[PDB]
Ligand binder design. Structure first.
Ligand SMILES: *[C@@H]1O[C@H](CO)[C@@H](O)[C@H](O)[C@H]1NC(C)=O
Ligand SMILES: *[C@@H]1O[C@H](CO)[C@@H](O)[C@H](O)[C@H]1NC(C)=O
Ligand SMILES: *[C@@H]1O[C@H](CO)[C@@H](O)[C@H](O)[C@H]1NC(C)=O
Ligand SMILES: *[C@@H]1O[C@H](CO)[C@@H](O)[C@H](O)[C@H]1NC(C)=O
Ligand SMILES: *[C@@H]1O[C@H](CO)[C@@H](O)[C@H](O)[C@H]1NC(C)=O
Ligand SMILES: *[C@@H]1O[C@H](CO)[C@@H](O)[C@H](O)[C@H]1NC(C)=O
Ligand SMILES: *[C@@H]1O[C@H](CO)[C@@H](O)[C@H](O)[C@H]1NC(C)=O
Ligand SMILES: *[C@@H]1O[C@H](CO)[C@@H](O)[C@H](O)[C@H]1NC(C)=O
Ligand SMILES: *[C@@H]1O[C@H](CO)[C@@H](O)[C@H](O)[C@H]1NC(C)=O
Ligand SMILES: *[C@@H]1O[C@H](CO)[C@@H](O)[C@H](O)[C@H]1NC(C)=O
Ligand SMILES: *[C@@H]1O[C@H](CO)[C@@H](O)[C@H](O)[C@H]1NC(C)=O
Ligand SMILES: *[C@@H]1O[C@H](CO)[C@@H](O)[C@H](O)[C@H]1NC(C)=O
Ligand SMILES: *[C@@H]1O[C@H](CO)[C@@H](O)[C@H](O)[C@H]1NC(C)=O
Ligand SMILES: *[C@@H]1O[C@H](CO)[C@@H](O)[C@H](O)[C@H]1NC(C)=O
Ligand SMILES: *[C@@H]1O[C@H](CO)[C@@H](O)[C@H](O)[C@H]1NC(C)=O
Ligand SMILES: *[C@@H]1O[C@H](CO)[C@@H](O)[C@H](O)[C@H]1NC(C)=O
Ligand SMILES: *[C@@H]1O[C@H](CO)[C@@H](O)[C@H](O)[C@H]1NC(C)=O
Ligand SMILES: *[C@@H]1O[C@H](CO)[C@@H](O)[C@H](O)[C@H]1NC(C)=O
Ligand SMILES: *[C@@H]1O[C@H](CO)[C@@H](O)[C@H](O)[C@H]1NC(C)=O
Ligand SMILES: *[C@@H]1O[C@H](CO)[C@@H](O)[C@H](O)[C@H]1NC(C)=O
Ligand SMILES: [Fe+3]
Ligand SMILES: [Fe+3]
Ligand SMILES: [Fe+3]
Ligand SMILES: [Fe+3]
Ligand SMILES: [Zn+2]
Ligand SMILES: [Zn+2]
Ligand SMILES: [Zn+2]
Ligand SMILES: [Zn+2]
Lengths: 424, 424, 424, 424
């Protein structure tokens, strides 16, 4: 069900050496910087970006960097990444890319300054891929009357690794496909397993190669040493991104980084604390059942201890939302190994159902365990709408329903400023 | 408690640019190759090694490679690594190193061809370090009347990272200290946490740097893509080394590698299957209690499924030997989370008590759980003596006892050729 | 007059990932090693070469290396270079390349052991390019009844740098064009100015990049530190190759290397001493008149001192052969600045007329100076046929004449074993 | 004769990780930027530089870069290079270096904006080295009542290459020795042969390695692609630095660069045109007689054509000043090979007599040829004092004379604004 190469969605912008595959993300810790990235195929081109705010129409120029990579018998085009910094909060900016030959213009809006009661609405997309189903989820998102403002992406971007020799073209088409959204609003990236791409057979053994060339993140903003785990703050939220497929043993860089990072969250500043990861810690579908155990045994207590609000994951191609549950009492022989309701624990949601290559995970653990509050095997996307320092409303819209039909919906009460039972 | 820099044990071989810190390991999959490694400090020197068998006294020459590294305000000398290959099994070889200026001679004996009933005796050392205690354990090993023939090293080599800026000299002194043994019999390396050395503060953020420059392993012999997990066969054993501090998520290179590797073990060929790792899966001391959970949740079933015989670990600075136990029935809600006796399960032994910087882990879990067969907080080393395809005898000698006093002893019955009850 | 891309001469060998652009050169100092190089375009492929002698039909395998490069908006295919060594002198060998997918077979004949009276016939080609004229010179060579056995190539290989952005395809077509000769007999390479390719404008500023990726030479055989100046011995000749466009100041690597090298020539072993370079030291055409002055002032005396026999050059697109002349008496104010006949001096010949992009240099210094013995502005190639330690016969065949019509011809008397006046 | 290691001049600034070997140069094309460089030996340290003008005492900070290198059995400390830019012309600046641990303060004065009649006084030092003689020349310079404001350095900095394995310490001592001057006024660098350091024997074969790590120049300011030839404008002068030991063949990068650069000189803007190079084009001493021939044959005409005023060189350890001479009429056979007076030709001066390792080149060519205006084998330094767009006064002070005794003196009349006869 992968959309064919000629699909209107994969068409290449016309013009000589016209910037294609345009995409953006936050470029700093707090909201006033963006990383613009794109690809030119005819020749190298300029890595300069021109931008100006709607109000103070003064045109400034940011100069970035260019790179390329070869995968097997494949060779990328010219990848560019430029970071515009020191933007003003809450203002619309226009940016142009492809200055030398054919220029293209886009716009984005900086978020509001970080604050306790600042509202903001995030979209949740996981496991997109490029099937027709993928196309549908993306439009439904684009049409959600509750306008999404940033997409928190949970992993498995294009599934190009399913093609022979991981046909990296499929990375190009995906990038062209999603530009309609990412050229305009940032998508926060998380690495999934389809991004690992360990292919000894074709002599490609550096994990995450294509993904890392194409998608950049402000990892040094948090003091991370790798782009696979980082953190950013935006509006009233503090987002922490983790890498299920990187290492988390005690003492490793990721473990060490997260320990420090959790100590840096200030709920008086960013009330909402969200964590993103690919492989779900709590999952009742048969597929990938219990894979999240190892990371679970390692970070769960931290999450309960710092009161994280939600934990979004993907990987299982279906939907599921749990109860605030914890299972942090086991000591091997004491037999205390059963998830228990805990109002300090975060809610674990899994939205890996945006489409992939058109396949859904339907078999599930029967009967629905206690920790599971709702599960459904349908394609869709989610929206996490922050309202106050106390309220945030989550929704799940199915691809079968109309754009405005929330097939599941829930209010979240801030584990810090209003820890009442939302566990309903 | 660490031995002082002037300790006789740290003395530098005399002569201009005299080879120091000499050491060896198996260099191929089956036994007929060695990797000789050493360091010269005055100037680069030759990386050629001259060797000849006692019988056919014809002198041949192997040419290797030289490298250097800088840690913080530290600079290595000239590290050399040369692989002699195509040796004859079961023969004494003499090798000379430092051909240009001051030459030094050593010898080693290739192991017997791999076989079903070929006996061999391994020493077990873990968490050595360089305290006086360390010195002791090493001598006790050197004196075991049951002559050890290869040391399986379980991790934490020198604790140089405990010194300011990880004073890499402590790596040099450790290398000079242990030469008395390693220059003559191979030691199989395993990476522990003291080897990670992630020091962002001094701008050292590439894990395992010093360890990796200094200690090489034949990882491509198994088709591993990293030197932190590999496998070798020697005599009647098939040894598999893993990395607690590397990644093992589903799909990762280490996970992928182990799955394939277990499929390649042939018990009709190497009856004994041993696994090495630093952080113990089963451990009842308070210190580092339950750190091995994550990896446990990922590899335990495979170990039971392939009937691995023993699993040596270190990290807890003390001794402990368990019962053949398994705990692979948990499914979150079914409450089946208690280690059970399983005769397909391997025996988990932890020997991280060779000395470190002179400190013992004594606080235990009271009371001694069922899975724990014997535990003692004493410094010491172990020996695993293979006898037939069915028998192998393990011993633990305390540093307080005399060289020949086995403070713990047990016979192992091959999980494949003689599955009768050991566990006692 | 550049042959069009569809020219039958540029056709690509059929088959999946079929080795194309096959080419060879001597791979050691004395004749018993070859460097096989080729290109595969579909995918990487194997860098193994299979070969066996006609006599002892035992098939052996040599394993080489693979590399790639990008020039501007260009990306090479997979370049391979493999060195077969330890060949037997004077024997025919078959070699196959493209082992994995589509295999191609060729053959070559090792030269005879170096000796005083060993005959051998070299072809002289300079400034080839890929015009139709180039095609003609190459056939005339292929048809010279005096069968050439090795081509000494004087520089300016393909003129791809004349195309926009140095369209490196033109490097591919040239390589395909000349395979008919180079896959079978070695061509010794010399770097000319069309190989420098310094293009700051397109950000290509490393001189000799494409040339160096594609054409390899045994420069370490002589103890050279760069592939732009080296030396080889073959049959009764000792060939020295220099780089007009590299540096030759006093103290530089090239200067230093040549000084030592000249001291290593043994005329009792290789009677004939030949030097190759691109820019001619003695030239009477108007084009490039006096460019060879700087190198001249630096090496001429050495040449006269060691009695080099001939000095072949190219660059001027025409033919010219001089008298044994020297001009090494100048001391600024003494006015002794006029070429004089000297029987210790080498004969300077220029054959840069094989074709280029179809243009000839016709204007010449009028009147023909004394040092010039013969000059003609015609396209052609040359043959230097060694006979004894005393005799060697040089010929120049014009493209207008028939294959067997020597338009100029001369006997050379060895400056060492028979320094009589051949200056006729 | 070289000063001993304990010489007071080689003492190391006290303090932990105290900045040593401090030095500066122009950092842009026109005068408003500086490159501060230094070395810290205890540990890496900060590469930030703090500076503020005397007037507007606002302290700003520039952040630079750190690097290290290894020569043979030698290892550099931590070399730092930071470029302060956008300075105001003609103002005193103070700069501090070593911000983390022990800070040191220095000052410099930006030159006046480029102009037709802007005076400036340059010092001329060549072949300094570190003998006692060297110490002397440096003091004499420091004391010239005609205060020098920038040193144009002609090559051969330290002669470290004379020590075994080119004992790079001699590079450190030289850097500490000269700090007294260079930390305060820029010295413009030129590469000489003692900087090449091609030492195959110890496996060092990349020319100019130590020199290049330690001494940086603003070569991209002119659009040069290498740091061995560049150009800067300062006050009323346009200085062009060349590399005798780099390549200058037709087509090479240096040749190509100079041709374009000469076209960019505007005498209406910087009336005085100076060229620096190591090996002198015109020299009548026996030592190194005629080494400058090759480059001469390549660039002389261009110098006459663009009317360069002076050409300073070193290499011959003595002094010599010529007449405005040219010798650009030779055409091989026309016998016109004798230097002739030419008033468009520059004056060739050689000041390689600052000291070296205490040795003078005294053997001259007898008799003093016509082109030579004055020559003397004494240690000394020079000063080139620009006065107007028409006048500039050059002086040569011997080490034997007193600080104010000009042992040779001459007025230069601008070849462009006042071409009357100087040559006397
Ligand atoms: C390279 O660029 C030129 C124009 O700049 C274009 O016409 C040509 O087709 C390009 N080639 C490639 C391989 O992109
Ligand atoms: C691309 O833009 C540059 C602008 O400097 C122009 O010179 C060139 O001809 C343009 N078009 C193409 C097809 O390269
Ligand atoms: C994808 O969806 C868009 C609208 O959301 C539509 O215009 C387009 O035709 C669709 N393409 C495919 C291949 O489904
Ligand atoms: C690439 O191809 C296969 C992968 O296993 C193997 O035969 C070969 O050695 C690999 N690596 C290289 C460098 O060719
Ligand atoms: C939080 O938002 C909800 C819905 O928008 C509203 O009912 C509630 O009163 C808000 N809380 C505050 C403190 O305004
Ligand atoms: C370098 O080598 C020389 C002898 O080869 C020795 O005398 C000198 O002390 C060495 N220096 C270092 C830093 O090892
Ligand atoms: C080291 O060995 C070489 C052998 O070639 C010798 O030349 C040198 O002098 C020896 N001694 C030292 C101290 O380098
Ligand atoms: C270490 O033990 C050895 C014998 O095993 C002994 O000779 C040596 O003196 C000891 N050194 C220290 C510092 O304990
Ligand atoms: C090294 O020192 C500290 C480590 O956090 C930091 O200030 C600095 O940026 C680090 N990295 C570099 C390249 O200096
Ligand atoms: C195994 O070894 C033990 C002790 O050496 C012995 O009692 C037993 O009989 C041996 N088995 C075989 C098959 O020889
Ligand atoms: C890569 O290789 C596959 C087969 O191995 C081939 O079909 C495909 O077209 C190749 N692509 C390129 C760009 O060479
Ligand atoms: C190429 O050769 C390999 C031989 O191992 C084969 O598997 C493959 O299918 C062949 N053909 C192509 C088009 O790749
Ligand atoms: C090149 O010459 C060959 C024979 O020498 C001929 O078969 C071929 O057609 C010629 N091609 C062109 C383009 O001249
Ligand atoms: C490449 O294009 C031109 C060449 O002069 C220039 O503007 C640009 O800076 C060059 N280099 C890079 C890295 O873009
Ligand atoms: C050299 O060769 C020529 C022509 O082949 C012949 O006339 C002459 O006698 C030969 N010299 C010797 C020594 O055979
Ligand atoms: C490294 O730094 C420490 C202090 O930071 C210093 O005491 C030690 O002596 C230094 N070592 C070297 C080799 O500079
Ligand atoms: C160097 O400076 C730092 C300043 O942060 C200080 O912590 C350190 O102790 C100082 N002294 C030494 C000897 O490193
Ligand atoms: C170098 O000269 C300075 C003054 O110019 C003097 O103070 C110093 O002692 C001299 N040192 C030597 C070693 O000549
Ligand atoms: C370094 O030492 C000598 C220099 O000629 C030589 O024997 C050796 O091959 C050189 N290079 C290396 C990499 O050892
Ligand atoms: C040039 O300077 C000299 C000496 O300072 C002076 O005699 C002459 O008049 C000056 N020229 C101008 C134009 O001021
Ligand atoms: Fe997925
Ligand atoms: Fe330990
Ligand atoms: Fe040419
Ligand atoms: Fe000098
Ligand atoms: Zn997934
Ligand atoms: Zn440990
Ligand atoms: Zn040419
Ligand atoms: Zn010199």
């Amino acid at each position: 069900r992968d959309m064919p190469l000629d699909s209107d969605v994969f068409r290449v912008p016309p013009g000589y050496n016209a910037p294609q595959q345009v995409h953006i993300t936050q470029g700093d810790l707090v909201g006033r910087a963006m990383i613009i990235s794109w690809v030119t195929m005819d020749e190298p081109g300029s890595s300069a970006v021109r931008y100006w705010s709607e109000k103070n129409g003064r045109k400034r120029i940011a100069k970035g960097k260019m790179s390329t990579y070869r995968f097997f018998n494949y060779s990328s085009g010219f990848i560019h990444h430029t970071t515009i910094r020191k933007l003003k909060y809450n203002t619309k900016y226009y940016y142009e890319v492809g200055l030398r030959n054919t220029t293209r213009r886009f716009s984005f809006i900086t978020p509001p300054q970080t604050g306790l009661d600042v509202p903001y609405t995030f979209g949740l997309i996981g496991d997109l891929g490029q099937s027709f189903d993928s196309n549908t989820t993306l439009s439904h998102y684009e049409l959600s009357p509750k306008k999404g403002q940033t997409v928190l992406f949970v992993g498995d971007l294009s599934y190009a690794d399913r093609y022979p020799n991981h046909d990296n073209v499929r990375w190009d088409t995906w990038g062209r496909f999603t530009e309609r959204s990412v050229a305009y609003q940032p998508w926060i990236w998380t690495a999934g397993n389809h991004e690992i791409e360990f292919a000894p057979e074709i002599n490609e053994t550096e994990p995450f190669k294509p993904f890392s060339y194409r998608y950049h993140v402000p990892y040094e903003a948090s003091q991370s040493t790798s782009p696979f785990w980082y953190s950013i703050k935006r509006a009233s939220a503090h987002i922490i991104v983790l890498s299920s497929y990187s290492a988390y043993g005690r003492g490793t860089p990721q473990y060490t980084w997260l320990k420090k990072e959790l100590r840096k969250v200030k709920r008086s500043e960013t009330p909402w604390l969200i964590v993103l990861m690919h492989s779900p810690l709590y999952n009742s579908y048969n597929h990938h059942f219990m894979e999240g155990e190892a990371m679970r045994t390692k970070f769960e207590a931290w999450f309960v201890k710092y009161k994280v609000d939600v934990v979004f994951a993907g990987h299982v191609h279906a939907y599921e939302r749990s109860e605030r549950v914890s299972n942090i009492a086991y000591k091997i022989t004491d037999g205390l190994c059963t998830p228990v309701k805990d109002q300090s624990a975060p809610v674990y949601i899994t939205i890996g159902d945006a489409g992939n290559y058109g396949v859904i995970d339907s078999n599930m653990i029967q009967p629905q365990p206690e920790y599971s509050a709702f599960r459904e095997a349908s394609f869709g996307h989610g929206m996490f709408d922050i309202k106050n320092r106390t309220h945030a409303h989550f929704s799940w819209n199915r691809n079968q329903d109309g754009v405005a039909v929330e097939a599941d919906s829930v209010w979240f009460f801030n584990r810090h400023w209003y820890p009442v039972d939302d566990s309903t």
